[PDB]
Design the sequence.
């Protein structure tokens, strides 16, 4: 589990969105595994606006933050989990790192701010849904 809190937005994995998220929906995209809902309180996270390929992510199944090198956001075919079939997920970045299903939620960050959240993985992989192209998260 986990979310990004920027401005009056809450960014979560679409497959972990709650009823309150769907009832206060701003935007969702199943191909990216992302959903954004509105919040009453302002958040403290800042979104990175950069092309970093190195950063650090949080792994809840190890209670640890790991430094990683990650690929550029791309269209990557994903093994069908409990929420999606085998499929192509867009705007996904891969890195070598431990992950288990509950880890969806964990932030990947660089020196500029939040880069994305954990979304897919396995066998020492972990995939992050990028958010750096969602410029509207910084306004309104
Ligand atoms: C970090 S996800 C992961 C680590 S080991 C196996 C998995 C894969 C998994 O169970 N999925 C991916 C997620 C989705 N986006 O639907 C649900
Ligand atoms: Zn950066």
Sequence:
């Amino acid at each position: 589990s986990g979310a990004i809190y920027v401005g009056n937005y809450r960014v979560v994995n679409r497959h972990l969105a709650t009823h309150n998220d769907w009832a206060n929906l701003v935007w969702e995209d199943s191909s990216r595994d992302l959903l954004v809902s509105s919040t009453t309180a302002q958040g403290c996270d800042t979104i990175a606006r950069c092309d970093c390929q190195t950063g650090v992510y949080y792994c809840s199944s190890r209670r640890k933050h790991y430094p990683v090198s990650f690929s550029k956001p791309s269209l990557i075919f994903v093994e069908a989990s409990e929420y999606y079939p085998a499929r192509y997920q867009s705007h996904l970045m891969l890195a070598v790192g431990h992950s288990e299903p509950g880890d969806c939620g964990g932030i990947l960050r660089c020196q500029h701010g939040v880069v994305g959240i954990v979304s897919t993985g396995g066998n020492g992989l972990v995939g992050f849904a990028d958010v750096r192209d969602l410029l509207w998260l910084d306004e309104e």
